[PDB]
Amino acid sequence: SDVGTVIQVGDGIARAHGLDNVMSGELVEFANGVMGMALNLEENNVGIVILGPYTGIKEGDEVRRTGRIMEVPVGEALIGRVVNPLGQPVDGLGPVETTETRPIESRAPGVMDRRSVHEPLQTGIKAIDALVPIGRGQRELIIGDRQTGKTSVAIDTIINQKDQNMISIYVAIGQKESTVRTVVETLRKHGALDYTIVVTASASQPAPLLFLAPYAGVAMGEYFMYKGKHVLVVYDDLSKQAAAYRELSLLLRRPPGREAYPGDIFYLHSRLLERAAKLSDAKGGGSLTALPFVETQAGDISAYIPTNVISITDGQIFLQSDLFFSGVRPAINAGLSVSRVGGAAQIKAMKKVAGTLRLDLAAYRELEAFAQFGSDLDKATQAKLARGARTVEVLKQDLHQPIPVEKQVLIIYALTRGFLDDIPVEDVRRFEKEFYLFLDQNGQHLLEHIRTTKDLPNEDDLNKAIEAFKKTFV
Amino acid sequence: DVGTVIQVGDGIARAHGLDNVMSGELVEFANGVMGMALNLEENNVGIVILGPYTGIKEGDEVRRTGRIMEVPVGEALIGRVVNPLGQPVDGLGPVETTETRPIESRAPGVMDRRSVHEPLQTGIKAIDALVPIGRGQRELIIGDRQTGKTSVAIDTIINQKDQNMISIYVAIGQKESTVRTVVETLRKHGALDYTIVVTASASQPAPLLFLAPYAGVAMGEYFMYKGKHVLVVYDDLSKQAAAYRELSLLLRRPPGREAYPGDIFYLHSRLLERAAKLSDAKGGGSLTALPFVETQAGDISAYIPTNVISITDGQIFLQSDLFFSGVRPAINAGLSVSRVGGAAQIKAMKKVAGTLRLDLAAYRELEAFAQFGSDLDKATQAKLARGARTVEVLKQDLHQPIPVEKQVLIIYALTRGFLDDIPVEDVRRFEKEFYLFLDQNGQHLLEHIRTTKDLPNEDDLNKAIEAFKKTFVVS
Amino acid sequence: MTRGRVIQVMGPVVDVKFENGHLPAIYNALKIQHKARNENEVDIDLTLEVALHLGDDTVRTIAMASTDGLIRGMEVIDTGAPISVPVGEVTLGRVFNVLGEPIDLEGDIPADARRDPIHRPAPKFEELATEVEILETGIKVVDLLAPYIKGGKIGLFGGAGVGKTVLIQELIHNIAQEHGGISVFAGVGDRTREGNDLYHEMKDSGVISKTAMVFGQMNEPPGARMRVALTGLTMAEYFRDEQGQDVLLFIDNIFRFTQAGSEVSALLGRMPSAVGYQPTLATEMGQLQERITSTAKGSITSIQAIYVPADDYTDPAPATTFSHLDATTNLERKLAEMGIYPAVDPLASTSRALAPEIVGEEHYQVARKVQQTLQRYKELQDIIAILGMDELSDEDKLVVHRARRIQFFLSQNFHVAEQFTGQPGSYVPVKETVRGFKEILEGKYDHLPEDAFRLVGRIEEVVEKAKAMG
Amino acid sequence: GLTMAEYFRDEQGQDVLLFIDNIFRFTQAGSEVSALLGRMPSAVGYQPTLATEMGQLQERITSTAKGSITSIQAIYVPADDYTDPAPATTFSHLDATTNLERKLAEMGIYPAVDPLASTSRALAPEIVGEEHYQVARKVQQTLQRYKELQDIIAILGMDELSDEDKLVVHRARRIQFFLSQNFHVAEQFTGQPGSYVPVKETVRGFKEILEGKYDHLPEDAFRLVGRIEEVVEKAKAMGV
Amino acid sequence: ALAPEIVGEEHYQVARKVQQTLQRYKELQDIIAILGMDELSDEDKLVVHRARRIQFFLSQNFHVAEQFTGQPGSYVPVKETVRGFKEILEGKYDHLPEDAFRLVGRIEEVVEKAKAMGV
Amino acid sequence: LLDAKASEHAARMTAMKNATDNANELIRTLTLSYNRARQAAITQEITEIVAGANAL
Ligand SMILES: Nc1ncnc2c1ncn2[C@@H]1O[C@H](COP(=O)(O)OP(=O)(O)OP(=O)(O)O)[C@@H](O)[C@H]1O
Ligand SMILES: Nc1ncnc2c1ncn2[C@@H]1O[C@H](COP(=O)(O)OP(=O)(O)OP(=O)(O)O)[C@@H](O)[C@H]1O
Ligand SMILES: Nc1ncnc2c1ncn2[C@@H]1O[C@H](COP(=O)(O)OP(=O)(O)O)[C@@H](O)[C@H]1O
Ligand SMILES: [Mg+2]
Ligand SMILES: [Mg+2]
Ligand SMILES: [Mg+2]
């Protein structure tokens, strides 16, 4: 029948006897009102994961079948609210008042139902827009050690999308509840909360809800994607999801692997990260795009969960601790950051300027790793080294201040074409600022064209404007 | 004596009954596929399936053969391609054997053995001169991938035509195309008329690979106790170790270093210690074995490599950088040794070349120092000149063995210094020409070494080598 | 007839009980197709592969699609046979999943198609071929400096953005055009953004008409991902067994076949071996590679990409895979940046056919010299990087000259390149490249502008292309 | 301890301090009882529920709208391995962290605090001021440059290098020793009585070291001293 | 049995001084692996010369080695072994080359083995 | 002085060539020790895990 009884209770796992018609993945309801999901079905024992406080469930208490597969509430009313992984409001402010539901175990968009990533996501970070392009419908990994910039890089991305016709979701997994509150008040101050959803899974909660938290977040975004608006999703640690599945499995007594991890780990992460796509014109041209985060201990890029997330994505941004403690900020290592969907997600103007820089930074990393100290080497080697330092000062940027794309292409045009040779390395950070002021007051004509035609204006006019400013600068 | 299968998974089954079954017995399923009984728990016998396991299902009818693991032996096996079980593979019909032997024989005990007093001439200049092997020895060929391992063994079997030896080749874990190819290569050189090739290629269940080396020695011991000398080659003992770990970790036996079940040493020794030189009371027979082990990173120092370096009476280490530097066969003199060697050389060869193995290691270091070195002295420069010629005198070509009387004559030239006059590239051609000249002109020297295993009068030999050097021309 | 019923479910694993004791064999396949009785239920259309006979008339099974939504007691039926996919001319120009269903919206393959098993006993020693033969690919660098072999396993190690997809497509075109043989592409664990781009490029390059493709996605449970290589294989077996033509099989990354095997060994409850890998690594790897053989009728040759797990070639996945490989082709980015396509590094690529018994003596001498010439130039490159060209000794200049021409004559104009460029392209027979490189190494053609050798075919083309400049 | 502090925070409403000594010994106890409770093992012999227990305890130790708990903890790094699960799981809960290193304790630089691996959410240009932040990050560049340069010195030798590299090693030695201090609880361990340095003074002094004003003094004078004034006198006794 | 009373003070002082030279050269070995002996100065140079002498003078010719190498064996009584090390440690045999110190029994044998070379 | 300065510059250049060649050889020898240690650490942790799991 549809009623069973609990026999073992412990650590957020219970075991039931009966409940013969249950499905794998169902929702089940205990007497206390706490809900649960069936993940195992042996011949005499049904295995239950509890999705709530398990200090009131006693042995012999009843458990009853809902009849629904696991479902997350969706609707326009969720925008601007702080919510649980289950559709339950947390900020106070009353009910969420949703209209309908979606499964959290959706199938991904197939081949023949997808298109090719062809449009940009302007992050407003000089290094991320120029050097490591993310295009709508890609999966981008931010992988790095603790204390290197990470939440800083995602928060800058949401703000710099204010003008653009975008929807953004933040999925905070395993984080201390005062830290989630610091990001939210911060977003209310920048006016960001009006078009965003924060989904929260604090460190006090049963592991199972941390596991569902990334799935609930994509299940909310896919509703808007199939309706046609573009959407962006950030997961605040996939390594903290991977820990909570291992705990649930080892209490369900399933067999171990490399580091106590269940044999499903590639299947769990892949099912979540392939629900990112650019749908085609028949599907209405919507798009998800995804930003998983992974934290690596002593930079072990070879660990089990890190080897796995470096593979499923369409690129990586590896961040290094020594660059940070050396003034390079954001601390993005150019050698280990690659985008395999690169070359299509930039505006036409930026593609021409960005190509030279990748070659320029490389010819410095090789030369500098040996010759910075040598007082005099060949005249070329001096030329490459000098533009090498200026490039690493043009890529430096401040916290919580994104830069619009037209200004990025202009500063990168000037460094690449040699206008910035005369300027010393220390004042490159100020020549930048003075140039932005001069461009606004005087050069309105050049900025008009790049935004509208994504294209670069006539060289003589650009050379004239930049050469004239070089006269003004002191 | 009847039981019933309860689990049939991964190549190991279990069966309920078979009351009088002896341990080690061959077991027949209802299907007619074979198996080995290895364990007897109180209600259940534990069976290893020695064949494809996808036709056996719970409910089948395993039956008892009545015989301990037994391999078929007889003279009819020579010249046939066979399975580890006595089953013909080449086509060509039945093997038509007469009798059987256990695959779990005891090794000839102490007081049933003797010391080695006859050579196993390989026709390879570096192995015969520097690292000698005699009948009854156990010698390890160690190296990395693509270094020359199969090439050294096959050169040995062809050259063991002239001498009255039986040779067995046991291919463990090898790709099937490489094996079919070796049989056609042996048929072309006429070798198959006196040999047996035993095959356990990679698509088969791991039990017939594990038994494959024990069937090969079981065929060779029949001939050994009847008095005729025998040689056995094992094509990968490190692939035998891998298949034993897989069978053990499926029976839930606890692991160890790497994941190797501790019974790796016992496995390898049980096989290698049946090689023996029987004494005159036993009729003076001999086995000899040349096991092969592959090593990761071309590093001598690792678990399975060191374990077989323990059971043998020497080792021949082959190096990958020597192989890519034109030295073929690629033999490291410093790390390669023979422990029963010193008695296994003919008298002329002991006198000619015993200080070559140690002196040649000294050149290897002094060359390495000299390249980075700026200015050398006269006694270092003279040593550097002889070392280069020795390395070119030890270079050979594939499938071309050199008779032992011709070996001692070319080595006499180098050690006594006649080859010092000739520029280096010419050394290989000087060696082909001297062998032709010996054939056409110098027959008296070649008659003396064969009968007395002994070197002729020094005046006559010095005369002859000067006479050849007049006829030779340069560049 | 008879039927089973489901008695346990855990992730990808399921157990079925067959009460009469009439049970399925170890690699047979089972269907669940069920219509929902009440609105609480979810309709299901799953299939399962057998793995172990546990006892008590029960069988352990791995699942090929998502197992979410399964009720205990749900009925289940046995097909009497392994997974079987359609073979013949029907499967050319189409895309299919592991089961054999068509993923393309190009109709459905009919019932009458002959369907043959994924799992089959391997080829025998009375059936193979005694003498090695060399396969002429029409590509200059590959045929000269790392000859491919009929019945061989070739390995591609290269970085992203070096021409992999172009080299695969040109090989498929040359074999179909000149040697008259089809190809198969089996993508083991591939990202669904790459499958779409590949189908569009295979169609827009015109190559599609001669190839059949199997895609197994990353989002599938491990068993489906593992057996995707075994269906691409069984399709190429019909073309060698019956049509008798030679066939080519491409595998997207062999590492994910080994990873899927590890993940299935963990679900099934087996004890891990060294570096946490399955206890049956070389019996799995061998049972794939030992079907890629040159039988008397015809041959299968395979180009397989491999990922080095940590930049460690001493690991148990590289160890077992490199045991089977006969040639290794490595693609370099520096060459690509400079303008050389195909971008294959002459000095890091190997073959076991480059020995004078197989290739013949003229080919061996010509090849070794090319390697000797290029390596010496790599040395003078750091001297020329620090100081001036005049500084080199005269003999050293006579090696700089030949190396620059040799490096360029390796470059070739492909036919699939005409979508990325505006020139027709050429195929070179092995005798013509061996003759030509002998002329360059004797210096007969040194009175020539350097760029005359760029993206050209036979050596006589250089003569005419020179005249074009003047 | 926490229930007592909670009553003082919530009902009385006074602000409160909590000192917890070795919170690792809480995590370690769970392991001992895990096997006898019937739990399967995880990672490096740890409980299958490590994050869950650390979260329950730590998420109670907070400063609410009613009142504030400042909480100060010692955390034990289980086998000198900061990559262990118990410390890694702990780093996610703090607002400010100092990591102590045995290599510094061997050199005798007490307190032995890693100036790079230690971090706080209060080192932000508006939370501490522009003058403070400038000096702080500039010290962190000097000490990261000294770390890479020590490898080159150890094999090739110090005289081989440039004037800018020499001046980095000069200043980095002084900065690293001037981070050491004479405490009142080190009265028992070192004889000397002890010092309290106000924040304004610390910024002045570290700025002088970076600008090179005090580079004439010998380096041993900077060890176990509190204010920069003292360092001048300590040198006088030596005779400089 | 290495204690002043058991061995005598002369043997004890000789054994400890030999073990001190060998430990210094197991630390110098990390720098001479890369640069060679140009980096070494003063005491480093003298210590490496004497360590090379000591390490080869601990090697011997055995009667059981006759089945492997044609040389005869040697038995060195204890009073002789101590005397040789002291002359090596003092520096009385600094002039003789390192290849003359290998596979010998007593210090007299090193002098005749050097004289055969003439180096 | 002409000969002295010329000979000093050449002496540093070979000393540097040999020093670099010794360093690169040490890097391959050390790299292999790291990979052998890394693979042993991953086979110990999995055997302790499975030893406890088999007991319970
Ligand atoms: N671009 C930047 N410029 C200056 N300071 C920065 C920049 N990005 C980050 N920071 C600073 O460095 C630290 C970055 O902390 P952040 O939370 O971004 O890193 P995290 O990796 O999320 O940390 P955790 O591992 O604790 O989650 C903070 O002190 C922050 O103010
Ligand atoms: N002396 C030689 N002269 C020339 N070529 C040789 C010589 N010895 C071997 N070769 C060739 O070099 C290659 C060596 O392959 P071989 O099978 O002998 O090595 P292996 O170590 O057994 O290889 P694997 O590890 O693949 O089993 C073959 O091409 C062989 O023919
Ligand atoms: N043979 C060639 N001729 C001309 N251009 C080529 C050739 N091969 C590659 N390219 C250029 O380099 C690109 C490499 O793309 P592709 O091979 O798909 O990269 P990947 O190796 O990542 O699959 C081509 O799209 C084209 O721009
Ligand atoms: Mg964070
Ligand atoms: Mg071989
Ligand atoms: Mg590709």
Numbering used by the authors:
A (entry chain A): 26 to 499
B (entry chain B): 27 to 501
C (entry chain E): 1 to 470
D (entry chain D): 232 to 471
E (entry chain F): 353 to 471
F (entry chain G): 232 to 287
The article reads:
F1Fo ATP synthase is a biological rotary motor that utilizes a rotary catalytic mechanism to couple proton translocation across a membrane with the synthesis of adenosine triphosphate (ATP) from inorganic phosphate (Pi) and adenosine diphosphate (ADP). The F1-ATPase consists of three α-, three β-, and a single γ-subunit, with the α- and β-subunits arranged in an alternating manner (αβαβαβ) to form a hexameric ring with the γ-subunit at its center. Moreover, the β-subunit is the principal catalytic subunit that undergoes conformational changes and, as they change sequentially, they drive the rotation of the γ-subunit during ATP hydrolysis. Here, we exploit temperature and time-resolved cryo-electron microscopy to determine the structure of the binding- and catalytic-dwell states of Bacillus PS3 F1-ATPase.
Moreover, imaging the same reaction, at 28 °C, would produce a structure of the enzyme but in the catalytic dwell, which could be used as a direct comparison to understand the molecular basis of rotation in the F1-ATPase. The predominant cryo-EM structure of TF1(βE190D) obtained when frozen from 28 °C was almost identical to the bMF1 ground-state crystal structure; two of the β-subunits were in a closed conformation and bound to MgATP (akin to βTP and βDP of bMF1), whereas the third β-subunit was in an open conformation (akin to βE or βDP of bMF1). The structure of TF1 obtained when frozen from 28 °C likely corresponds to a “hydrolysis-waiting” state where the enzyme is paused just prior to hydrolysis, representing the motor in the catalytic-dwell state. Although the structure was highly similar to the crystal structure of bMF1 in the ground state, one clear difference was the βE nucleotide occupancy. In the crystal structure of bMF1 in ground state, the βE site was empty and did not contain any nucleotide, whereas the equivalent site in the cryo-EM structure of TF1 contained MgADP. However, an exception is that ADP is observed bound to the β320∘ site, whereas previous studies, based on information from the ground-state bMF1 crystal structure, hypothesized that this site would be empty and not contain any nucleotide. An obvious alternative explanation is that the ADP observed in the β320∘ represents ADP re-binding from solution, with ADP being generated by the enzyme up until it is frozen. At 200°, the catalytically critical arginine residue of the α-subunit (αArg364 in TF1), commonly termed the “arginine finger,” is in close contact with the γ-phosphate of ATP. The hydrolysis stroke occurs after the catalytic dwell; MgATP is hydrolyzed to MgADP + Pi in the β200∘C site, resulting in its opening to a half-open state so that the γ-subunit is pulled towards the β200∘C site and pivots around the β80∘C subunit with a 44° rotation, MgADP and Pi are exchanged for MgATP in the β320∘O site, which reorients to a half-closed state primed for the ATP-binding stroke.
